[PDB]
Amino acid sequence: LVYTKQTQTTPPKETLV
Amino acid sequence: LVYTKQTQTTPPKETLV
Amino acid sequence: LVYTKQTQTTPPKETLV
Amino acid sequence: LVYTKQTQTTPPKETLV
Amino acid sequence: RKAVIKNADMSEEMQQDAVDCATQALEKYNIEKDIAAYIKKEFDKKYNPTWHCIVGRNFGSYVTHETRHFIYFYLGQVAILLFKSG
Amino acid sequence: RKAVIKNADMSEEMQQDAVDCATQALEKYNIEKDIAAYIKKEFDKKYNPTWHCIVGRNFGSYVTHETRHFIYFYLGQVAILLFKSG
Amino acid sequence: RKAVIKNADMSEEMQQDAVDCATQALEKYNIEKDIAAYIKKEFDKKYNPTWHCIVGRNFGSYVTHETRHFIYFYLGQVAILLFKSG
Amino acid sequence: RKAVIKNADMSEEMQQDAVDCATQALEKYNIEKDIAAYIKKEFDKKYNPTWHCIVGRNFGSYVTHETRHFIYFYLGQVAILLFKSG
Fold first, then answer.
1. Mind giving me the DSSP string for G33-64?
2. How far apart are CA D11 and CA H86, in angstroms?
């Protein structure tokens, strides 16, 4: 078998300001 | 006597994906 | 007469990579 | 055929300061 | 899908018949066993017993045939071996 | 590499011989044409003409054999068809 | 947003298709995973399996591709890598 | 730098190997292309072709993998995607 996958990255949200 | 026979091959199914 | 023959197949070489 | 390749990205250098 | 003839020992005509009966088989049938079955049955019809057919992409073979009654050819991607050993 | 016997019409013993002569061939030889050639030559030796051998992974077939003298089996990944049509 | 082609090994046309299918994806979709998903799905459509797409700003890669079926390019700020390894 | 495993479809062990081969790569190499190159080369070694590696912080992806041979994980700040599509 084969499977198809997404991968997004959680670009570490900007520190509050 | 004689006999007539088929032979197909089970080309090992593609691994899931 | 009768003759004996080989037959191999040129399993189309994998595309360069 | 097949070929193997690198790809790095030029994360647009930080504006002088 | 054009034919390449790889090795023959066959009546030039017969060679054609074969090549023909193959193009047909490949319309009719998708499984290799069928295809080969079609062409075998054909030739035992047209010309007598006893023909054996092999079809695939990936195989080799060592086989004994009546003089003038052997052929081995591609039909584009797919390899057809046909002989009588009667 | 264990054998699966898919279809036989063969002396149980003979069946073994075959299965044996195959494991050997697969040590000796890497190309399919050779392998099949080994086993054909063998059986024409041990038992008489006229045997034909096919080896590969990807093929089917339609073929006529003498009663009791047909066998078709995997040797793990690789498929062996052997019959006499004499 | 003009394209820079950084490395290709691709049908010149195909190269365009890609560049096109990217400008579109970037209208449709804001998240990178989507964008790449769009373009992958596209090419598996137009040309066969099996394409993989990566999109972002910040990444490198080591990857193996079918001859003639690799491309890597900016669309202004944003980097697109696309290849088939089929 | 502890690992988070985000998505896997991988032999638990293999999962470890990967996680290991990553911590190493990150000692050796500073540029992402190298890092990914290290780990790709590794796995093609340990397990067969054909693996592709991506490393960065900022990217998403749409990609097709062999069953059991996909993994995607952080190594603290830095994201590693690794799969075979063979």
1. HHHHHHHHHHHHHHS-S-EEEEEEEEEEEEEE
2. 30
Q: Report the distance separating Cα H73 and Cα H8, nearest Å.
A: 8
Half-sphere exposure of H48 (CA within 13 A, CB side): 3
How far is F73 from F64, CA to CA, in rounded Å?
17
**What's the rounded Cα separation, in Å, for the pair H34 and F44?**
59
> In chain G, what are the domain boundaries?
1-86
CA quadruple G27, G28, G29, G32: dihedral sign: negative
**At a CB cut-off of 8 Å and minimum separation 6, what does A3 contact?**
B16, B17, H9, H64, H65, H67, H70
- Interchain proximity C8–E72, CB inside 8 Å: no
Give yes or no for a contact between H26 and H35, defined as CB atoms under 8 angstroms apart: yes
- Strands (E) across H1-86 are located at 3-10, 51-66, 69-75, 78-84
The DSSP output letter for B16 is -
Tell me if the domain spanning G1-86 has CATH number 3.30.740.10. Answer: yes
Q: Do chains F and G touch (3 or more CB pairs under 8 A)?
A: no
Structure determination method: X-ray
Tell if the CB–CB gap between F31 and C9 is shorter than 8 Å: no
Strand partners, F52: F83
Resolution (A): 3.2
Question: Is H7 in Cβ contact with A7 (below 8 Å)?
Answer: yes
CA distance D7 to chain G (A): 5
- A15 vs chain G: nearest CA distance in angstroms? 19
Write out chain A residues lying below 8 Å of B15, CB-based. Answer: 1-2
Q: Are residues F36 and F19 in contact, defined by beta-carbon separation less than 8 angstroms?
A: no
Rounded to whole angstroms, the Cα distance separating H79 from F41 reads 59
CB atoms near residue G16 (< 10 Å): 12
Measured CA to CA, the distance from residue F45 to residue F58 in angstroms comes to 28
Q: Which one, of D3, H77, H56, lies nearest residue G60 by Cα?
A: H56
Chain H residues touching chain G at CB-CB below 8 Å: 31-41, 49-64, 79, 85
Q: For chain A, positions 1-17, list CB contacts with chain B under 8 A.
A: 1-4
Alpha carbon H40 to its chain centroid, in Å, reads: 7
Give the number of residues written for chain A: 17
Q: What is the CA radius of gyration of chain G?
A: 11
